[PDB]
Amino acid sequence: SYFLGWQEYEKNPYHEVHNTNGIIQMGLAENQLCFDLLESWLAKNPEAAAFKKNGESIFAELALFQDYHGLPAFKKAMVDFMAEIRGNKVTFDPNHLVLTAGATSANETFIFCLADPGEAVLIPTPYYPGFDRDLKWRTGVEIVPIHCTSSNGFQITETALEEAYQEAEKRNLRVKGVLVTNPSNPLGTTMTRNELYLLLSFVEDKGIHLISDEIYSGTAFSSPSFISVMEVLKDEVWQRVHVVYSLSKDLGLPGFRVGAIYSNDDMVVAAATKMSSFGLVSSQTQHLLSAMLSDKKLTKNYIAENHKRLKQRQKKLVSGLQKSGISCLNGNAGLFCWVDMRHLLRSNTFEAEMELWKKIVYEVHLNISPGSSCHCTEPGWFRVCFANLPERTLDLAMQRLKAFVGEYY
Amino acid sequence: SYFLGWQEYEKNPYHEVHNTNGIIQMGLAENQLCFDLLESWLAKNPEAAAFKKNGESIFAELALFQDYHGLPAFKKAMVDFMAEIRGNKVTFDPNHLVLTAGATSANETFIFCLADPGEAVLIPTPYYPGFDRDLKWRTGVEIVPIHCTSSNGFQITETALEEAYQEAEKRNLRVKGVLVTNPSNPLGTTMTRNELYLLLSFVEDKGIHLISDEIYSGTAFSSPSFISVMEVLKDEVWQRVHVVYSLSKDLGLPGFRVGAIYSNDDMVVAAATKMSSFGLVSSQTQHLLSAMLSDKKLTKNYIAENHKRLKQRQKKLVSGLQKSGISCLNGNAGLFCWVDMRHLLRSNTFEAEMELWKKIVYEVHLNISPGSSCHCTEPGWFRVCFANLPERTLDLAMQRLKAFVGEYY
Numbered sequence A, B: 001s002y003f004l005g006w007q008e009y010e011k012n013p014y015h016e017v018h019n020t021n022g023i024i025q026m027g028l029a030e031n032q033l034c035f036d037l038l039e040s041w042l043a044k045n046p047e048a049a050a051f052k053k054n055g056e057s058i059f060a061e062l063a064l065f066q067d068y069h070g071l072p073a074f075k076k077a078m079v080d081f082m083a084e085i086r087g088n089k090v091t092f093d094p095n096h097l098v099l100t101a102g103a104t105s106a107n108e109t110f111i112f113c114l115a116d117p118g119e120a121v122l123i124p125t126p127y128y129p130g131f132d133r134d135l136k137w138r139t140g141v142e143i144v145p146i147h148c149t150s151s152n153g154f155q156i157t158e159t160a161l162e163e164a165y166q167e168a169e170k171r172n173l174r175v176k177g178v179l180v181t182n183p184s185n186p187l188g189t190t191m192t193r194n195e196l197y198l199l200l201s202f203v204e205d206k207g208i209h210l211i212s213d214e215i216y217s218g219t220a221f222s223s224p225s226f227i228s229v230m231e232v233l234k235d236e237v238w239q240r241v242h243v244v245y246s247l248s249k250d251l252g253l254p255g256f257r258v259g260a261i262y263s264n265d266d267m268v269v270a271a272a273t274k275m276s277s278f279g280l281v282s283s284q285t286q287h288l289l290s291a292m293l294s295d296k297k298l299t300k301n302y303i304a305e306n307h308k309r310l311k312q313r314q315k316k317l318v319s320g321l322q323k324s325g326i327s328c329l330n331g332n333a334g335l336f337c338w339v340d341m342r343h344l345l346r347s348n349t350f351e352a353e354m355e356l357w358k359k360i361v362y363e364v365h366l367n368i369s370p371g372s373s374c375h376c377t378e379p380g381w382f383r384v385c386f387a388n389l390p391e392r393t394l395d396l397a398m399q400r401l402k403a404f405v406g407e408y409y
Helices: A004-011 A035-044 A059-064 A072-085 A102-114 A158-170 A193-206 A229-234 A266-278 A283-294 A296-322 A350-362 A391-408 B004-011 B035-044 B059-064 B072-085 B102-114 B158-170 B193-206 B229-234 B266-278 B283-294 B296-322 B350-362 B391-408
Strands: A097-101 A120-125 A142-147 A175-181 A209-213 A241-246 A258-263 A336-340 A381-385 B097-101 B120-125 B142-147 B175-181 B209-213 B241-246 B258-263 B336-340 B381-385
Touching: A004 A350, A035 A296, A035 B059, A059 A283, A059 B035, A072 A097, A072 A283, A072 A296, A097 A102, A097 A266, A102 A175, A102 A209, A102 A241, A102 A258, A102 A266, A102 B266, A120 A158, A142 A158, A158 A175, A158 A193, A175 A193, A193 A209, A193 A229, A229 A241, A258 A266, A266 B102, A283 A296, A283 B283, A296 A336, A296 A391, A350 A391, B004 B350, B035 B296, B059 B283, B072 B097, B072 B283, B072 B296, B097 B102, B097 B266, B102 B175, B102 B209, B102 B241, B102 B258, B102 B266, B120 B158, B142 B158, B158 B175, B158 B193, B175 B193, B193 B209, B193 B229, B229 B241, B258 B266, B283 B296, B296 B336, B296 B391, B350 B391
Parallel strands: A120 A142, A120 A175, A175 A209, A209 A241, B120 B142, B120 B175, B175 B209, B209 B241
Antiparallel strands: A097 A258, A241 A258, A336 A381, B097 B258, B241 B258, B336 B381
């Protein structure tokens, strides 16, 4: 099973001053690189966390605030932040933004809005394994893969899109849309302009929706440039293009459950707004983050430093892997690298991938993600996260791996 | 439509020092009676809201806390509070408690866990109108009413339960359970021991589930005593009895989205835990409320004062209505009274009920809820809330009503 790495991590987690031989966590896309910036801001600006505004208590007002349209000040701060992430190249109407309890909630809600039980959405592989639950479990909707391969850097092609559409037909499924992750989990790459145009042309042709999960939008730290699906729209189909966002991966606030749906379609906004009743964001949290994200000095510095620190860590992982003779898909975004260990497989099979994976868990004591867990069609790729560890622990992990490679290979 | 009262309230809301002739809100079950107690506690105990524990920052730890089992300290505080509400007559295993984003989320999640699309749950009428969305919209599950009438104080009878079960059969629906509200919204009454035994006998016989939405459990302020479904269980079917709870109505914190599912069935707990991923409680809020609810002085005083203040307001509403010759169903819980205006109807029809309701909105400028919106089978009942207004505003509303009654009657 794909839960073996996590099971062993829970039983024997690494700790530098208590359990040095334990399992190092590199399987969770978690950003711990910039908390000092947020803590520093909170220290300087204690009011919002204290339920005060202009020296007055607003505890009661927030305690009572249960409106499914969200706190207006927070939605304004959110759309401003989304524009800033995109270099102010696109703007978002806060009336078209719907807050949800994380992107987990946003993605499920989009599926409920756009597809009926027994229908399907297309998703490029490899993809975020959470989607197999989020998009399918309560919705009765199926996923049909758009297979991407390493030959062209795991990019979406017109051929793969057509092949997916015909697999859906073979499965007797009606396709309602395509959901992409831009930047990609697990590839760590930004979608290309050509891919975006191909996707837009395709959903135009098929009369379906395009949902772009842009949760990693603020984490593009090297060339080429991140391009939001909404930017390509500037240069019918307009009503069928939608965005999912969250503060979980850029700001590192997954516990606070801040997600968002953005749609140009008034009816989708209305339906999603009503559905948000099942997963609203705490008004306490909306207030705090409205204060934080309204501070333009903080947002500018946060994005800049997050880019700086993410880039430094990715480079350290890439360099560490290179010393064990291991290459990565050349990436520029996200909290992880997509790592090529095909040459370490016993054979070109997923059985071989799982053998290697288990050796890494048990002998190297690293938790990483096998590519088959992300539905990669090529055995031997792994997702390896870099944004949750101290630099020294990342270095230790690289040292362990090198010793492992030297011994068995 | 039933949204007319709210539409007019939004357009012309009462304000004592800006809009004295505006519409007074008595249609929203909102508890504003005890915020001073919470504000006072926050003033004395500023640490949790400040992301500190024992003088150390725990911001990062909370920011990262996204576990669907919930914060252990908070689940412990919650089960302790639930026991305290029930006079410590029953205890709850925190491992069997699942946090959700409000009771809205908890109720929907229970339906997803217990019933498939096209199946049904039985609900005593009158009931909370939100259920028509919460229980049905995304679940594909139907509601079949268990009709209660004023002849016996709107209590559930064996005959009504059997009639409901046979309506489900006529509708070709498989019944999966019964969902009750104890204490009741909109009746303002606590369920009787005989009703609870009848319900338990019935779901035992039919092999179905009993879900008790006990969101108003802490608001029972006069005799007879509140009896939790879990208390009657003390004196097979045990695995099929479940509880929904929330901090929205007792503590008046609907904006914070704190709901809970409690089940004795390990498999229901596991499924609901996984489903909670779509509607987790903010870790910021879990931490704050864990601190608050862990303070046994606060919880004891809060329950005592909430009972005191709720009772005083209910008595004021009852007395005010009596002066217009209007009686209520004798109640003892909740944030509202169930008011008998049958004698003010033009005729014994729901058309007459709606005529009266609209006159109250437009001529008396009060927003109250017509009983047909709660699926009451007898025209002429209304829900009138009392816990959101200043005493003087409640008094004003009663004055307006008396003038209206005197004029047209």
